[PDB]
mmCIF file of C-alpha atoms and ligand atoms in Angstrom:
data_model
loop_
_atom_site.group_PDB
_atom_site.id
_atom_site.type_symbol
_atom_site.label_atom_id
_atom_site.label_comp_id
_atom_site.label_asym_id
_atom_site.label_seq_id
_atom_site.Cartn_x
_atom_site.Cartn_y
_atom_site.Cartn_z
ATOM 1 C CA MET A 1 14.476 2.942 -9.890
ATOM 2 C CA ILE A 2 12.920 3.406 -6.568
ATOM 3 C CA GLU A 3 9.625 3.490 -8.698
ATOM 4 C CA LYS A 4 9.898 0.036 -10.256
ATOM 5 C CA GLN A 5 10.872 -1.498 -7.017
ATOM 6 C CA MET A 6 7.867 0.142 -5.364
ATOM 7 C CA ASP A 7 5.639 -0.881 -8.232
ATOM 8 C CA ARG A 8 7.029 -4.326 -8.137
ATOM 9 C CA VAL A 9 6.228 -4.595 -4.370
ATOM 10 C CA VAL A 10 2.712 -3.254 -4.864
ATOM 11 C CA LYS A 11 1.883 -5.818 -7.687
ATOM 12 C CA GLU A 12 3.432 -8.485 -5.418
ATOM 13 C CA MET A 13 1.106 -7.607 -2.526
ATOM 14 C CA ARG A 14 -1.970 -7.759 -4.707
ATOM 15 C CA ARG A 15 -1.148 -11.296 -5.631
ATOM 16 C CA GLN A 16 -0.592 -12.394 -2.078
ATOM 17 C CA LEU A 17 -4.018 -10.789 -1.205
ATOM 18 C CA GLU A 18 -5.554 -12.702 -3.971
ATOM 19 C CA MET A 19 -4.200 -15.926 -2.353
ATOM 20 C CA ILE A 20 -5.835 -14.847 1.008
ATOM 21 C CA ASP A 21 -9.079 -14.047 -0.879
ATOM 22 C CA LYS A 22 -9.282 -17.640 -2.132
ATOM 23 C CA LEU A 23 -8.098 -19.344 0.994
ATOM 24 C CA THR A 24 -10.652 -17.688 2.995
ATOM 25 C CA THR A 25 -13.219 -18.446 0.498
ATOM 26 C CA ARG A 26 -12.310 -22.075 0.466
ATOM 27 C CA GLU A 27 -12.360 -22.182 4.177
ATOM 28 C CA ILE A 28 -15.890 -20.656 4.240
ATOM 29 C CA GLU A 29 -17.202 -23.181 1.800
ATOM 30 C CA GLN A 30 -15.579 -25.955 3.755
ATOM 31 C CA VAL A 31 -17.327 -24.843 6.997
ATOM 32 C CA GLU A 32 -20.692 -24.666 5.112
ATOM 33 C CA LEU A 33 -20.173 -28.092 3.807
ATOM 34 C CA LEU A 34 -19.412 -29.614 7.301
ATOM 35 C CA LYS A 35 -22.269 -27.935 8.961
ATOM 36 C CA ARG A 36 -24.747 -29.927 6.759
ATOM 37 C CA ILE A 37 -23.206 -33.322 7.488
ATOM 38 C CA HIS A 38 -22.460 -33.029 11.222
ATOM 39 C CA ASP A 39 -24.874 -34.090 13.812
ATOM 40 C CA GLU B 1 -3.740 -22.840 8.080
ATOM 41 C CA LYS B 2 -0.037 -23.638 7.100
ATOM 42 C CA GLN B 3 -0.807 -22.123 3.610
ATOM 43 C CA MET B 4 -2.238 -19.030 5.212
ATOM 44 C CA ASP B 5 0.526 -18.169 7.423
ATOM 45 C CA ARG B 6 2.906 -18.771 4.519
ATOM 46 C CA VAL B 7 0.888 -16.102 2.727
ATOM 47 C CA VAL B 8 0.579 -13.742 5.538
ATOM 48 C CA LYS B 9 4.269 -13.947 6.446
ATOM 49 C CA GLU B 10 5.040 -13.065 2.805
ATOM 50 C CA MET B 11 2.547 -10.278 2.947
ATOM 51 C CA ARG B 12 3.903 -8.912 6.193
ATOM 52 C CA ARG B 13 7.314 -9.246 4.641
ATOM 53 C CA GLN B 14 6.150 -7.281 1.507
ATOM 54 C CA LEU B 15 4.696 -4.621 3.726
ATOM 55 C CA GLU B 16 8.092 -3.983 5.543
ATOM 56 C CA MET B 17 9.731 -3.623 2.004
ATOM 57 C CA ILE B 18 7.289 -1.054 1.154
ATOM 58 C CA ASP B 19 7.842 0.801 4.403
ATOM 59 C CA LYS B 20 11.546 1.068 3.668
ATOM 60 C CA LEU B 21 10.902 2.114 0.046
ATOM 61 C CA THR B 22 8.564 4.945 1.292
ATOM 62 C CA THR B 23 11.368 6.125 3.639
ATOM 63 C CA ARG B 24 13.735 6.499 0.747
ATOM 64 C CA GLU B 25 11.032 8.280 -1.096
ATOM 65 C CA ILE B 26 10.779 10.772 1.728
ATOM 66 C CA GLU B 27 14.412 11.455 1.631
ATOM 67 C CA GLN B 28 14.162 12.231 -2.125
ATOM 68 C CA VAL B 29 11.220 14.580 -1.563
ATOM 69 C CA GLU B 30 13.111 16.400 1.327
ATOM 70 C CA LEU B 31 16.005 17.043 -0.977
ATOM 71 C CA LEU B 32 13.714 18.115 -3.762
ATOM 72 C CA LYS B 33 12.095 20.501 -1.333
ATOM 73 C CA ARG B 34 15.507 21.895 -0.381
ATOM 74 C CA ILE B 35 16.413 22.617 -4.030
ATOM 75 C CA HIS B 36 13.037 24.115 -4.729
ATOM 76 C CA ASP B 37 13.260 26.485 -1.720
ATOM 77 C CA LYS B 38 16.755 27.572 -2.793
ATOM 78 C CA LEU B 39 15.903 28.385 -6.247
ATOM 79 C CA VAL B 40 12.960 30.468 -4.964
ATOM 80 C CA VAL B 41 14.814 32.459 -2.371
ATOM 81 C CA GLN B 42 18.227 32.973 -3.838
ATOM 82 C CA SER B 43 18.806 35.661 -6.568
ATOM 83 C CA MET C 1 14.867 33.246 -10.881
ATOM 84 C CA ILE C 2 16.473 30.762 -13.116
ATOM 85 C CA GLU C 3 13.294 29.022 -14.301
ATOM 86 C CA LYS C 4 15.273 26.659 -16.662
ATOM 87 C CA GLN C 5 16.337 25.143 -13.388
ATOM 88 C CA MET C 6 13.105 25.477 -11.729
ATOM 89 C CA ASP C 7 11.352 23.948 -14.576
ATOM 90 C CA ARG C 8 13.299 20.781 -14.052
ATOM 91 C CA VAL C 9 12.423 20.775 -10.371
ATOM 92 C CA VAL C 10 8.703 21.304 -11.128
ATOM 93 C CA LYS C 11 8.835 18.517 -13.732
ATOM 94 C CA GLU C 12 10.157 16.320 -11.081
ATOM 95 C CA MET C 13 7.604 17.277 -8.529
ATOM 96 C CA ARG C 14 4.764 16.618 -10.856
ATOM 97 C CA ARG C 15 6.441 13.160 -11.815
ATOM 98 C CA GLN C 16 6.720 12.175 -8.076
ATOM 99 C CA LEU C 17 3.272 13.366 -7.512
ATOM 100 C CA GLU C 18 1.831 11.207 -10.258
ATOM 101 C CA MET C 19 3.730 8.136 -9.058
ATOM 102 C CA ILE C 20 2.600 8.503 -5.421
ATOM 103 C CA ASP C 21 -1.096 8.967 -6.673
ATOM 104 C CA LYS C 22 -0.771 5.578 -8.575
ATOM 105 C CA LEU C 23 0.700 3.908 -5.488
ATOM 106 C CA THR C 24 -2.000 5.237 -3.028
ATOM 107 C CA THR C 25 -4.731 4.120 -5.373
ATOM 108 C CA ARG C 26 -3.377 0.697 -5.687
ATOM 109 C CA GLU C 27 -2.874 0.348 -2.081
ATOM 110 C CA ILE C 28 -6.396 1.706 -1.549
ATOM 111 C CA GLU C 29 -7.706 -1.195 -3.664
ATOM 112 C CA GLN C 30 -6.022 -3.612 -1.325
ATOM 113 C CA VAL C 31 -7.509 -1.977 1.638
ATOM 114 C CA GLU C 32 -10.798 -2.310 -0.042
ATOM 115 C CA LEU C 33 -10.187 -5.936 -0.837
ATOM 116 C CA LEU C 34 -9.009 -6.481 2.902
ATOM 117 C CA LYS C 35 -12.233 -5.021 4.129
ATOM 118 C CA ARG C 36 -14.236 -7.450 1.910
ATOM 119 C CA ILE C 37 -12.222 -10.289 3.298
ATOM 120 C CA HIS C 38 -12.869 -8.991 6.831
ATOM 121 C CA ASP C 39 -16.665 -8.896 5.945
ATOM 122 C CA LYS C 40 -16.792 -12.368 4.659
ATOM 123 C CA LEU C 41 -14.879 -13.842 7.531
ATOM 124 C CA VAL C 42 -16.837 -12.058 10.035
ATOM 125 C CA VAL C 43 -20.350 -13.283 8.986
ATOM 126 C CA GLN C 44 -19.343 -16.180 11.227
ATOM 127 C CA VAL D 1 -11.255 -24.612 11.476
ATOM 128 C CA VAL D 2 -13.733 -22.223 13.067
ATOM 129 C CA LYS D 3 -11.122 -21.103 15.665
ATOM 130 C CA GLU D 4 -8.591 -20.534 13.015
ATOM 131 C CA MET D 5 -11.079 -18.310 11.177
ATOM 132 C CA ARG D 6 -11.525 -16.037 14.223
ATOM 133 C CA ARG D 7 -7.680 -15.971 14.263
ATOM 134 C CA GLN D 8 -7.240 -15.088 10.575
ATOM 135 C CA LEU D 9 -9.782 -12.250 11.187
ATOM 136 C CA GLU D 10 -7.273 -10.549 13.662
ATOM 137 C CA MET D 11 -4.465 -11.134 11.114
ATOM 138 C CA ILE D 12 -6.390 -9.544 8.383
ATOM 139 C CA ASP D 13 -7.430 -6.589 10.580
ATOM 140 C CA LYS D 14 -3.664 -6.087 11.483
ATOM 141 C CA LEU D 15 -2.807 -5.934 7.752
ATOM 142 C CA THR D 16 -5.578 -3.554 7.113
ATOM 143 C CA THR D 17 -4.213 -1.169 9.745
ATOM 144 C CA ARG D 18 -0.645 -1.422 8.356
ATOM 145 C CA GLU D 19 -1.744 -0.681 4.842
ATOM 146 C CA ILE D 20 -3.883 2.205 5.781
ATOM 147 C CA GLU D 21 -0.823 3.667 7.688
ATOM 148 C CA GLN D 22 0.989 3.298 4.512
ATOM 149 C CA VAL D 23 -1.606 5.008 2.525
ATOM 150 C CA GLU D 24 -1.733 7.714 5.111
ATOM 151 C CA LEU D 25 2.130 8.239 4.778
ATOM 152 C CA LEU D 26 1.967 8.454 1.083
ATOM 153 C CA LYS D 27 -0.956 10.883 1.080
ATOM 154 C CA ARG D 28 0.998 13.069 3.444
ATOM 155 C CA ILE D 29 3.786 13.251 0.917
ATOM 156 C CA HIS D 30 1.457 13.899 -1.898
ATOM 157 C CA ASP D 31 -0.066 16.772 0.145
ATOM 158 C CA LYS D 32 3.379 18.257 0.686
ATOM 159 C CA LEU D 33 4.152 18.334 -3.059
ATOM 160 C CA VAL D 34 0.906 19.910 -4.056
ATOM 161 C CA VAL D 35 1.365 22.870 -1.872
ATOM 162 C CA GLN D 36 4.838 23.244 -3.397
ATOM 163 C CA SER D 37 3.393 23.506 -6.818
ATOM 164 C CA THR D 38 0.965 26.271 -5.773
ATOM 165 C CA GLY D 39 3.334 29.031 -6.695
ATOM 166 C CA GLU D 40 2.234 28.541 -10.353
ATOM 167 C CA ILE D 41 4.420 25.393 -10.381
HETATM 168 NI NI1 NI E 101 -3.052 14.022 -6.687
HETATM 169 NI NI1 NI E 102 6.731 25.993 -5.549
#
């Protein structure tokens, strides 16, 4: 009982962390792109 | 920026749930310790 | 010492112990992932 | 976009701190159980 709930919360945190990983990655690539084109 | 906060807020949210679950786990361990100690020290 | 009873308590301690090890290692991977994200974001 | 990155850096740092404290707390519970198994448990 407490064990599934806790397992379920950990699994769900890893998923939100993956979202942050991509977002930050996409933000870094967007900065790199904008740097080239801006005067 | 709006998508990040949505994910952090849900992460911070998921962190509090874990904190409460850990508290209930401690209570379980404290009781298990009480039982363990009684079996050892009673006759 | 009634070890029949004691053996149930030990079985339950080892089980809790195994569960906690799984949670800490999975949380540790997140901490590791968070550190990498921190490194990436910090390069700028 | 740059400003928001430095802002997200602090947010990630704060999440790292909260998760480490949780790891620390679970480790403390683990260390208590171990000891209680040392009597040939
Ligand atoms: Ni262990
Ligand atoms: Ni013991």
